[PDB]
Amino acid sequence: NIFKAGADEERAETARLTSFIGAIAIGDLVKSTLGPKGMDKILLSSGRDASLMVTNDGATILKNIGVDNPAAKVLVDMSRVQDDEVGDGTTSVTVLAAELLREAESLIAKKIHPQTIIAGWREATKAAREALLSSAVDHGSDEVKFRQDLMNIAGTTLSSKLLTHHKDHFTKLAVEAVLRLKGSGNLEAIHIIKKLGGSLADSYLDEGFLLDKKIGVNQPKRIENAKILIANTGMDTDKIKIFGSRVRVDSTAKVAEIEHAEKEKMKEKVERILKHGINCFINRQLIYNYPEQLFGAAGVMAIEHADFAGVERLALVTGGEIASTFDHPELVKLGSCKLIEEVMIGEDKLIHFSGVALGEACTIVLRGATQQILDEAERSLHDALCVLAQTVKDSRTVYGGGCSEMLMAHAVTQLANRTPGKEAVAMESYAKALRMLPTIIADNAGYDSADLVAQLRAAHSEGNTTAGLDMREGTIGDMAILGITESFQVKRQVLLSAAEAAEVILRVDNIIKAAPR
């Protein structure tokens, strides 16, 4: 009667298998999606048929699938961090980590202790990290070359996405957004408008931080020297966000009293707003037509129906403040904006700023047939802006297509020459896990991976630290000439997050499950 009635315990023999079988399964699940020729995958929730969809995004596959194994949940949570934080490498982390555990299970079969494996992987990760640092190439001068690298990195992130067909148009949108930024890589300043109609190639752009919202009924199409005052409170009617409070109604006169009482409340709140001495008002809640004319009489731009990102983004673009409450006047920072003009893109009134303080912001205007096209367009494009913003903060770049993965694997094999006994065999498996990444990119594309990958070994072994996979022609070519490169911080985090993830699984040797409630 050790563990019964829901409570279970897997011994060292079984927990060693369940820990790897759970993690290796998640790797083999989404390894097919690796590369530009990645294989699609159907997702269909049980019990419901409307949840059908098809995708080749390794991040989207891991978010939706549920996980009961604790070893797999660690590897999945460590992957979602890469998607939310870095925006790229979600699939390589899951594959590189799983391939390490697959090789580790063969090492423990040879009576190699998990702690002896972890010692080698720590030394290999240092030599592997040192390889990227030496081969990395920064660009302080020659902004044309640095601009070209952002275009190549944008294509790599957009590969195997919905926008891969017309990536040549989106590479000019994402890079122009980050190029126009030229400073702090805050993606809050980079708005993404989503409107119906037109193909993907019809995606426009605006450098004045265009908005995805229309305001008022009859608002001025131009305002000079507008002072921004953002707010967040009820301004349409009474009993805002109040449930349970009622009102007695015996005749229509009491409704007219509510109309007067409404106008009285809107009057006093409009007075406090205008006491600041402003020319532009923004609120998250809708602005009723009655206070609109009161702001209209004062020439104040009555912006309504703002969202959480609108208050979070407009405050820094115009240099303003959130300033939810406006009881006391002249105690919040008014923004800075030269012109707030009306613009029509996609048959909708849009708010176009100009000359704002810190006017390096911009907006990317997407165009599509429906919202499902625009949603995925925002996700993959935002993922490019993440690494591209990281490329501005760190101008170092490394060659992709199996060049970086094979270069790191070569340094590990060199380190295996000068090392104690058991650490050599463990570090050899760390290199094979890195070499399995281009093997999967070639297998998914249909090319002979054993020929291409083994050729890259002979290439990197004797100089030539540029060779990689040419998915276009299906052969080996210089990644610099072909124009393929990835950020250094992305490959760095992919190497470390994968090693740290697999290190946690080896340290585990016994899973404990108590009686579920």
Partner: protein, 516 residues
Amino acid sequence: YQDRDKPAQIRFSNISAAKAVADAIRTSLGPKGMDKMIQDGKGDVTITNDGATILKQMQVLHPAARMLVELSKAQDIEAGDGTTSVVIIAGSLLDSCTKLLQKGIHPTIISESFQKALEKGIEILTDMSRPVELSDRETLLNSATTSLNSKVVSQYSSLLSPMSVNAVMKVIDPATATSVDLRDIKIVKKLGGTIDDCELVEGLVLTQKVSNSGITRVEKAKIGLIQFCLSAPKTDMDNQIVVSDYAQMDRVLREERAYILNLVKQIKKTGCNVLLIQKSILRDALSDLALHFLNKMKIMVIKDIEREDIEFICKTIGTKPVAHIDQFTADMLGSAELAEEVNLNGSGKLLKITGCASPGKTVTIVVRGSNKLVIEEAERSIHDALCVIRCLVKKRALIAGGGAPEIELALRLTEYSRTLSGMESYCVRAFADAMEVIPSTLAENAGLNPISTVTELRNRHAQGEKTAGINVRKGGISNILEELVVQPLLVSVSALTLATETVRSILKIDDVVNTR
């Protein structure tokens, strides 16, 4: 090899489920297609040969097989014809893929290869097609008439076909515009009368009545769309009306009339002389008291109208939806010259409003007939006429039927594969052999030999042109160009385009994951 991991079992699982849907719908191809028996769960049974109707009544549960069902719907929206030919083509390509995958070819190489055959395929069909003039209403009449003869109604095609030709040429600039919206031409029908009695109205025609309103006519109307229900005071939350005596009971009636009139006063200020009330069932859309006040303001009552019927009214007169009386204004109003409700013998109580005077190109067709079926097939035929005509606007060309495009496509693609290098040769040859399933299916349904028919035609196409195709009317091979059995180019092009994309999509499925 060991082949420990076997993800290919999901490919054969998706190909078999995809091929199963095609094998069932294959026999129903062409005019001589063998009918099929469908039995509803209740006990009812029906017989039909339309492939679109059979796929809907199949209750497909597999994901890959559902892609062929949704694929057939895409062909109906785009082209409106060739619905059955698409699913048959996809089933044969996937069946051909089963031979290539056994040879050790990857799905990505097969997918990219099929796109090259599709790229060269569209060039083959476009080169051998017959261009026509869109402004020439002679070709459009005989094109839809001869095509409608292959449809259900063979006698009344000469009446409904030119009604659709004029309806499109009226709203579409002849030989200038490339896109056409079928929603801009509404088709109304009522019992009584006959197919000969029809009217192509330049304004709009509805089906509901304006009763109990007594206006019946509003000239120079500024039509407006309001979705909020006009009625007495109502509150969804817990409330209670107070009544101290009979005076308060009767006073509430005076205060109830005010609440209905207060919203009408705001509408009167904008000049809106006709209101479009959205159809609503959850609550009283228009109470009885609202009728007389609207009659006092000389407003015509239009209620119980469908959103799709309002969608036709949206682009026709340029009206916008209004969710609340406070947002109602004058800028969101349409227009009309003379509004009225006509009640003819067979046309019924129709709402005929002419002279829109707004930016827009729309018309409407009135139809009459004895039984519901007599008018039902009239509107079904007008859609196929509008669909085939829409195919000619986008692609001003024609091509022969009888599977002749599939033979010229299969013949020249085999010659194109000889010039290619790599795995694309066998992948494109398999794409060519898959096209031969269509004419062999037509030959089988026509009582001919499936092999000798396509085998003879492949020689007539090497020596001749695409005119050689199967003629089921005579029961043998004949010059289809002389028989006047043609179809537009968009049907054959959109079929290869959408079918190949589905095959490429199904080929890229490595596995399926069950979420929760």
